[model samples]
Target: EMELKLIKIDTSHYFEKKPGLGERVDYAGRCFYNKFQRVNAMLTSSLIQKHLKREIEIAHNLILRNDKVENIVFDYNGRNPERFYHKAQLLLREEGFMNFTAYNTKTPGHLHLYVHKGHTELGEGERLVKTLSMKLAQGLPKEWKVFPSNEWPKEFNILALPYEVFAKERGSSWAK
Candidate 1:
């Protein structure tokens, strides 16, 4: 009964700092990032569904509001990620964050997730994601990624938009 309707959201609703500034990284033959600039991207449900149908290994930084970010994403970057994904849901629930989506990445066994926690300061957001990742890493892969991390876009720590979704949940139930 759950359909991804709000799959893509407008960035206008979120404030972005250092707009038009992103990282500059040259990959093997192409530019992984070009001069680090903010993306005025308006994500849509249609796009999200399209991404869910076909996934890739691409990621980008999210909007920041006064050094803060909203809807923090948790990246489970490890083998056998499905197990950690389940534990992640439990941990998020135990920590009182009940809104999240679990996604299957282009890489087999890799998982991605995002939590609805509103806008939080960069430092606090780092602590939150790091803590959660650490908690979920016990006896596991011990590695996870977070979008809108402590800093601007640079590494895989950024959120991978247009991702293939595995499942989303709200308040312990399947998210609608």
Candidate 2:
């Protein structure tokens, strides 16, 4: 079967802390633990298609249950160790699953996702999804531009690739 990888680049610092309150919550910390749980679940005879959904559900639950989790930020700051990025990378590498590499783009902080062959099956094919770039933070003197308010309508752009393309990229037997 063809293997497909969905690459997503999102504003990492935006979820660093909740608005109004200056204190930083364990966004990545909580996510790392949650992701570990879900990844473990996925490794244990679970379907890969549910990785995103399950991890997202876990994150939402954490936000709801943890009174400190007021915002949807993944803390990439130097202070936290249990953040999602590090943990996910560590776990993925250790487990020899799909590879993940952070794009050192001028956009400051972002993340990338990879879906490999036999890792996930989307019935017809796998999908590539991207989120709409909306305002996140105000003027911040950095390498790239920052949107003010940091409030987005939560819209995403998805592109579904057929098995041919996915198979070709991964050299899968399903490739035409």
Candidate 3:
């Protein structure tokens, strides 16, 4: 089991109005004991649906806190999600990166790949992940992009929660 830490979440993101007017807002963040608990709470406490639950779980597993990069995510905005998903898998396979995970985002044809932290040194791991993202972007369409477009930051927020959760919370539809 991975040791989990509570990250401060901005209350504004979760509430409908300013928190004080009888909204019953509690602490600014919630505590998660383990990855499974975190994932379950993240999906269930929010508005995500059962159909997209498995994908969200997979996505969270890929980048759950470890020891290297503070936050790492491969955001892919493209035209064909299935193709992008398989391409990501193929790239990871060819490069022997078995730890990463991919999931569809809230936008149709958009996907996010979470690359688990590796290497003990922060700079080294961030460089490695950035290079991997660049390599993956090499032949993609112009509009298709990967995040961390340049130098990696020394500190970053947690990898974003699955988009389906956000979409559902906002009353939007999930991507196929």
Candidate 4:
């Protein structure tokens, strides 16, 4: 099995307020490896596979819900919602970005999308993904939000985990 390369887990900014015993411990800043071992470990676990399938199902549902709608919110000075949605849908369709994960973000009128994994590999993969995201954002009517922003370094981008896997283990239990 291929070893999954992971970036460093940063915990500095997390856990400012300590929770009492039996309270929900926030694993916000911690990376997945600590709790789940490594990516290979997760890949081999039937439990992880089950959860991954669930995540995929959730993503598919979200895609269906947001289909044909412009889920991205432009900035204050950007185009109206209707126009933005229309243009965004057209742009995305034209750009051949059909298979993607679109989700709401903390910021209103803004959302994030990660293109399904392509042939992105180590050296050029990160750059390509960043460039692709930037191009997609630039082609939009205004500054519509897209994650894995170009501002992030290649190393960060390279090591970033898929949202599906991350989301699965966070709030819900496998047996649930």
For candidate 3, give the lDDT: 0.43
Instruction: Give Cα-based local distance difference scores for all models.
Output: 0.61, 0.23, 0.43, 0.31
Poorly placed runs, candidate 1 (over 4 Å) = 1-60, 151-157, 172-176
lDDT tens digits, residue span 24-105, model 3: 2233353322222223333334433332443333223221234434334567676776666666667765666555555556
**TM-score for model 2?**
0.22
Q: What's the best-to-worst order under lDDT?
A: 1, 3, 4, 2
lDDT (C-alpha) at residue 92 in model 3: 67
Q: For candidate 4, what is the lDDT?
A: 0.31
**Number of backbone collisions per candidate:** 12, 4, 0, 1
Of the candidates numbered 1 and 3, which has the greater TM-score value? Answer: 1
Off by over 4 Å in 4: 1-86, 122-150, 154-176
lDDT per residue, candidate 4, 1-176, as tens digits?
11221212221211111223323223444332221111222222343243334432111101112122112212222424344445544545555545443333323443444344343334343355445546646655445533332343211222112222111101212333
Task: Return whichever of 1 and 2 wins on TM-score.
Answer: 1
Judging by lDDT, tell me the better candidate of 1 and 2: 1
Q: Compute each candidate's TM-score over C-alphas.
A: 0.63, 0.22, 0.46, 0.34
Predicted model with the maximum TM-score: 1
Q: Least accurate stretch of 10 residues (summed lDDT) in model 3? A: 165-174
